[PDB]
Amino acid sequence: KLSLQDVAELIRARACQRVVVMVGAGISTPSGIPDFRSPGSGLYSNLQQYDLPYPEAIFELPFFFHNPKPFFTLAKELYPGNYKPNVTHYFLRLLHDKGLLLRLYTQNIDGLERVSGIPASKLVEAHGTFASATCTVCQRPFPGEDIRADVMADRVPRCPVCTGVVKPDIVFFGEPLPQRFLLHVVDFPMADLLLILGTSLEVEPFASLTEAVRSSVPRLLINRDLVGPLAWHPRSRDVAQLGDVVHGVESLVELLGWTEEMRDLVQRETGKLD
Template sequence: CFSTRSLSSWHVACRRSSRTNECKLLIKQTPHTLDGRGTSPCQTRHLTGHASFTIDNIAEVIKHSDTSRVLVMAGAGISTASGIQDFRTPGSGLYYNLQKYHLPYPEAIFELDFFFTNPKPFFEYARELVPGKYAPDGAHFLPALLHRKDKLLRMYTQNIDSLERLAGIPDEKLVEAHGTFSTATCTICSARHTLEDIKKEIDEGTVPRCREHGCKGVIKPDIVFFGEALPDRFYMYAQDVSETQVLIVMGTSLEVMPFAGMADEVPSDVPRLLMNNDRVGSFGIRAKDVMQTGDIVASVEDLVARMGWDEDFKRLRAEWTLRTPDEGTKYC
């Protein structure tokens, strides 16, 4: 079974072998494509009996001078407003554009066996998503603003589009659970490379080759392919969930393990805010759960307004737009 998903998010699952206790990464089928845009403004929802804790309470907790450990989890839904195409939209999705490569199935471009046989389809994908073509949207600037305010404990993202970095979240505050395009590795000699080392080839639609000592091996961006382990940094979550004072979950279906499990591992008395198209995961069963459903950017702007940070938020976004963008950047 294969999932339909936005380009910017990997959907992998963890299955443990009873014989080896080894964690393997698998695709997990999801029932729909996650889309954070919504058709209506954000709405705050509570289950019966939980209405006493509201979005205003969340805002007050975050604003409080003693709060400095806000944990953010994000998925593909935070990048749809940036214009990143989805995977299978008829006539325009990535798979439609890759049909000329006669893929056996869409996800083959993310499998190592297929990559070693024919890396060309993957680098066609990479040319579409390589950092520099898209601009962060409002959802990316919320954790960046929390960082500016010394409130951000960490941001964990399923996305590989690097828009969190562009929004201003530093490396030490960001965990790209499913890898990154920012670095790359030779598949033969394991030489390390940066995005700048291979960006020209990717932009030209060619397969980047290693030049270390005449190696000529294919250089693979450091994103997680099926069957590969998640980055070691991901497992910092075990300590982060125990320390967080507020959890914010944005634009994710919470259906893919082990990423999704983080939301349930925060202590039961920690406020949890969901900003998503729909209610997902276990949200709604805890007394301090708040759900804002609908347009994610509208939900972000609503929270920022309730915290009285409107001008700071506008200033942060304005600072980004004043930078000289790479040619071809798509603005939302």
Template structure:
């Protein structure tokens, strides 16, 4: 990267990049989301994101969704590092499994982002796919109500991809992006959910793959590693900060964080003052 050999970097991320923002990942024993679903009365943890289970009983997901909706958490250093890749003209695309919206919140442009498992930004009927106002869906869910489709009366849900649903069309940009990549950066993922997990195997064999993660996962569990595969394990935010320091980017990332946080705080204050101004 310092020599300018990496100009089309593809980033692949999972829930681990958001734990530093206070959002639990899915699979960590004891603290992960799947380990704390007893109160939702589901037959097995993953069923809360299963479309057939949702069809029969949407309430467990809606109860969980109240805590998952964007707005309560801020992007962290890792998100801003990815944005720095974009600012420096090196980011081809970032593919995320996350539905927390923190990539957008930190300023990564829409055309550089693939939210492979959807997001809360839009909503639609889970049966007939009729669009539904996302703000109205959120208001109903926050008030323990089930938003229903005006066309077929089925339950409406945020456009988060459940097990058993099709991936968003944008996901299929991977067929163009991964063959173009000259560096694959993988962070904060268990690489257990298909077909997302297999994306990392679609870059050219000569392309370096760097895993920054808590544990070795997927093809990085093999011994010996494939030539051009590299692994650094530990606390992800610490690893990414070290990486940025090696590149001489730490000040750039931190300055971007300060500027974006100031902008978000200013926007929030303006929104809070609007009702008073109108009255």
């Protein structure tokens, strides 16, 4: 078995020059975005009135068409400008700035990867995005800003042409993933290191990507705990840094020697935003 320090050494020594990254809700909680709807929250209390019979319903087409308002409440919260990237995002950004990032795969819909400065070409947003929207009736496309006013004012955005409800390009349940998601066929075999941060690995097809690298490739998990294939069906070059994700990241960064560059970066970026 290898160690965090080992992986850091492989990067410092340029053994591994192409890193694929998988991330999930865990990397955004430090920015103050809740996950499970478990929490007593500004979110959970707002949706409380709305009477979602259960959390999954917010991403379900039949429920959305019956009552789009609980979902647009969520949209109001996640719309760009409300939350800021945290060190985990900035770490990924540094990883790209240094030439290490093959591709970043995110299940998050908060758009914080893009906001941190990571180029779109390097990003696969697998659950979609609030950057654009589509009319549910006529299929006419719209940039996210066209519905911004309605969303902030709590009005359901309606199509200017057909009056149909305009839905942000978030992936609902039972919908296929965006087409960029198919890059994983090229990406994963080409990858010499896999990074997995802040994810349960319960949502598919996204989850299965973990198995898609070669046996020679180390899979480093930074998460509260062991999850998915890394647990059920582990591998020799697998590595777990278990605990709070920000601490796992800060440790790696220090092992990489990037701590001071990393702080200068985050300081400059965060200051700019708020």
